[PDB]
A and B are shown apart, each in its own frame.
With several copies, the nearest count.
Chain A
Amino acid sequence: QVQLVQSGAEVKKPGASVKVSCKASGYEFTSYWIHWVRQAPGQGLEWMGNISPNSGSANYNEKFKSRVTMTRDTSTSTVYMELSSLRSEDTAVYYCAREGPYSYYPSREYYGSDLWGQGTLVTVSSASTKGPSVFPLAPCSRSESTAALGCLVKDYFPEPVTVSWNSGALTSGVHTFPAVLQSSGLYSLSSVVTVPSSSLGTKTYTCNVDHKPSNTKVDKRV
């Protein structure tokens, strides 16, 4: 199978180092250049450098040269990316990609990066595993035709948290927002639902929260 398989998600502390791997499969390893391209959350794509899977000769972006080292292991058909002196700014999804095939024939015309790995999320944080605190989102008074209700899932690490309503029976009108990173180094998200004003008192609305890293399961009727 023609693949680029990468190592798993990493949580690293500022000043530390990360080593990401990329395992080539179902093709001539020696025939394609391997690039490392990173994507910061909500940003574009940034090239960090590449390596020749024959010689192990690596080429680096001057922005990362001083902190980055790329290596290869022909026996395993794997390439590595080591980033040092980690800063918050290095929190990104790191991708490996192949460009070729190329032989001993040079060309002024190049192929594109046709095959990418699944990516590796690297999180740079001084924080440790922590389960959230769930709070209701309820209006001040009782009204209008439609009411909004929700759950605030605050102060957890790392991502993700899953949120369902009425144990999965309520999907329509649900908005589970992307998590935000707070100045504390902990995550926070909110899930909301729009329901009819008439139903309040009679119909129940319960959010089901799951943070598998801390093994936190919570059900909250709002």
Chain B
Amino acid sequence: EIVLTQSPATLSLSPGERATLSCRASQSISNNLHWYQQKPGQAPRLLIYYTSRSVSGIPARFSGSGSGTDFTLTISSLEPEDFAVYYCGQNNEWPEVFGGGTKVEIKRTVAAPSVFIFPPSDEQLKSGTASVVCLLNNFYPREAKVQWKVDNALQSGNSQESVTEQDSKDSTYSLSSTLTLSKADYEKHKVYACEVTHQGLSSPVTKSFNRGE
């Protein structure tokens, strides 16, 4: 079957700049390659059909091109409403196949995260579980590493992280990591730390507390 490979996974640019997106088919799909835009909470919106043809209601800044196996989507000058996910989709053969997507993110200066740690509440501890939350507030770029350490032992498989969508006013991201333990496991240790690694920080930052202090 056909595999459409989009490149790069993420594109960081400012309004007014030119955006160039790649889609490489595993084998020939003639010129039956289409381009779609997707905003959070909405259905994909067709931009360009049959490699380079125009779509009713789609602004002129959008254009496409392609040379047999390699396709390109060009956005002449970025408007604020252009920051979104873009897919390429083939319909030459069945099954129809789509690429992995390219996220077009607003470029901004590097901003270090403000890091906060929260112990579990006594009301939670009474129920038999302990959730320890670490917050990374308003940072740029998106790439960030959170490492939980329980009595200096590195943790894994017992945490889940969540990231906000890029902020409308300051173009940063925020992240929360939650380490879930049983009261039994939680009560067997003292030091609970959250180590944060980001480009904005000159060496990693740790936030900790001691159980019952």
Contacts and interface: CB of A to CB of B under 8 A. Distances in A.
A140 B50 contact: no
B91 A110 contact: yes
B162 A137 contact: no
Contacts of A194: 114, 137
Given A44-B87, A136-B121, A148 B137 contact: yes
A37 B133 CA distance: 36
A135 B121 contact: yes
Contact of A112 (B46, B95, B161): B46
A116 interface: yes
A140 B119 contact: yes
Contacts of A61: 95
B131 A154 contact: yes
Contacts of A176: 164
A26 to B, nearest CB: 14
A118 B43 contact: yes
A117 interface: yes
A113 B89 contact: yes
B99 interface: yes
Interface residues of B, number: 52
Given A135-B131, A175-B164, A146 B91 contact: no
A47 B97 CA distance: 7
A178 B178 CA distance: 13
Chain A, interface SS category: strand
B116 A180 contact: no
Contact of B137 (A45, A49, A135, A175): A175
Given A113-B34, A175-B174, A146 B50 contact: no
Contacts of B35: 112
A112 B120 CA distance: 51
A112 B118 contact: no
A168 interface: no
A123 to B, nearest CB: 16
Interface of A: 35, 37, 44-47, 49, 59, 61-63, 95, 97, 99, 108-119, 133, 135-140, 146-148, 150, 152, 154, 175-180, 182, 188-190, 192, 194
Interface of B: 30-32, 34-36, 43-46, 48-50, 55-56, 87, 89, 91-92, 94-101, 114, 116-121, 123-124, 127, 131, 133, 135, 137, 160-164, 174, 176, 178, 180, 209, 213
25 contacts: A35-B96, A37-B44, A44-B87, A44-B100, A45-B98, A47-B95, A47-B97, A111-B50, A112-B49, A113-B44, A113-B46, A116-B43, A116-B44, A133-B127, A135-B121, A137-B133, A140-B117, A146-B114, A152-B124, A154-B131, A176-B164, A177-B162, A177-B174, A189-B162, A192-B176
Given A135-B131, A152-B133, A178-B163, 18 more contacts: A44-B87, A45-B98, A62-B95, A95-B44, A108-B30, A110-B32, A112-B35, A113-B46, A113-B91, A140-B119, A147-B116, A148-B135, A150-B118, A154-B131, A176-B164, A182-B160, A190-B178, A192-B116
